[PDB]
Write a protein that binds this ligand. Structure first.
Ligand SMILES: [Zn+2]
Length: 383
């Protein structure tokens, strides 16, 4: 409503998804903006239904959470035209991962059903309604945890269990082929083999509903082919991963199963360095590191999406993934003769691109990036 417009009697105040940035960019104003962002975010949640309707349709949710993959990395690797990108139904162009470290990224994704917390708040219990997989478990979705690695490094599996709330045994990894040896010496299993094992298991369950969290490490720095001294080239590993995901999408299409696949990277690999951070360093969660390619694809729909993916251009983060899940949770979109793809992809929650690690916050303010180290004065991020 403009200055000489009127609201209607009884109108609620309109709550914007992103707090305004009209004040000049001083330390005090950027500090105040961040506190305003935290306040607004803490009031945001996806509301799941109390129970599924009796005519709900079972399907499987598979969340594919990829370490060390940002749009900047895809560009630097020369992989923007890989066929995988064109295979999604929905593709986010300004999805912010909120952090540049793996543990906090996974916790943020597991807490996708509420607005974005400060880094501090990630490591304290959240409201039960914030845990996406718990919301689904409540509605009868079997929970699965899957990885292409053992989760030992960095206490990652412990963080997923303790702070992410995912209290499920790691799916059996015995007999899987090894694709890489990790920077810590342990195996990174072949992703197509992990996904095919998942697909056989789900196929054993029938018209079950299930929700799987799958974390993938092949793009992490320091990974090598067994016996090879040098770190495998990033673009070779990324091509291999994208070819395996595309092959799996083909397998999923052939299966006829109803599946919602969400691909959401944790954070970038810092393949292309910048003034402050040489290639591979990611202690500051810069815009390049945190703008990641998130996508959604539906399989087994009576009326599948045709043509190129629907681009979501607005600033987004995990809350938008949770909203797409609740829009799908009754399974009815899978059996509709005609889907309103506009409505399905419109009015998704927008989230300002704020990113944090324990010691640093990065924001965009009036279109420019700033960093705050340990609660001190804001400084322009040097890009
Ligand atoms: Zn990671």
């Amino acid at each position: 409503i403009s200055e000489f417009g009127s609201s209607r009697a009884g109108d609620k105040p309109v709550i914007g998804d992103m707090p305004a940035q009209t004040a000049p960019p001083t330390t005090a104003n950027l500090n105040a903006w961040l506190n305003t962002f935290y306040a607004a975010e803490e009031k945001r949640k996806t509301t799941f239904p109390a129970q599924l309707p009796p005519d709900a349709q079972p399907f499987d949710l598979l969340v594919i959470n990829i370490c060390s993959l940002s749009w900047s990395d895809v560009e630097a690797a020369g992989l923007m035209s890989h066929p995988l990108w064109s295979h999604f139904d929905i593709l986010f162009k300004h999805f912010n991962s909120g952090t540049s470290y793996s543990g906090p990224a996974a916790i943020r994704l597991l807490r996708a059903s509420c607005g974005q917390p400060s880094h501090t708040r990630l490591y304290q219990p959240a409201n039960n309604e914030c845990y996406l997989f718990d919301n689904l478990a409540k509605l009868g979705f079997t929970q699965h945890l899957m990885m292409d690695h053992n989760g030992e490094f960095g206490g990652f599996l412990k963080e997923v269990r303790e702070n992410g709330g995912m209290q499920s045994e790691l799916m059996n990894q015995s007999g899987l082929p090894t694709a890489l040896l990790s920077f810590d010496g342990s195996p990174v299993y072949d992703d197509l083999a992990v996904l095919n094992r998942w697909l056989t298991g789900e196929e054993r369950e029938a018209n079950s509903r299930s929700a799987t969290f799958f974390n993938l490490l092949p793009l992490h720095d320091g990974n090598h082919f067994p016996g090879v001294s040098k770190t495998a080239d990033y673009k070779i590993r990324a091509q291999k991963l994208f070819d395996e995901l595309d092959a799996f999408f083909t397998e999923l299409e052939k299966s006829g199963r109803k599946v919602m696949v969400v691909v959401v990277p944790e954070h970038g690999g810092a393949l292309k360095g910048d003034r402050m951070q040489i290639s591979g360093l990611r202690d500051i969660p810069s815009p390049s590191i945190t703008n990641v390619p998130a996508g959604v694809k539906f399989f087994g729909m009576k009326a599948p999406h045709e043509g190129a993916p629907i681009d979501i251009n607005q600033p987004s983060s995990y809350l938008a993934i949770s909203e797409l899940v609740v829009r799908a949770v009754d399974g009815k979109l899978f059996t509709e003769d005609s889907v309103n793809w506009n409505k399905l992809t419109s009015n998704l929650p927008q989230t300002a691109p704020v990113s944090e690690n324990a010691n640093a916050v990065v924001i965009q303010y009036q279109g420019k990036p700033y960093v705050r180290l340990n609660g001190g004065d804001w400084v322009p991020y040097p890009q």
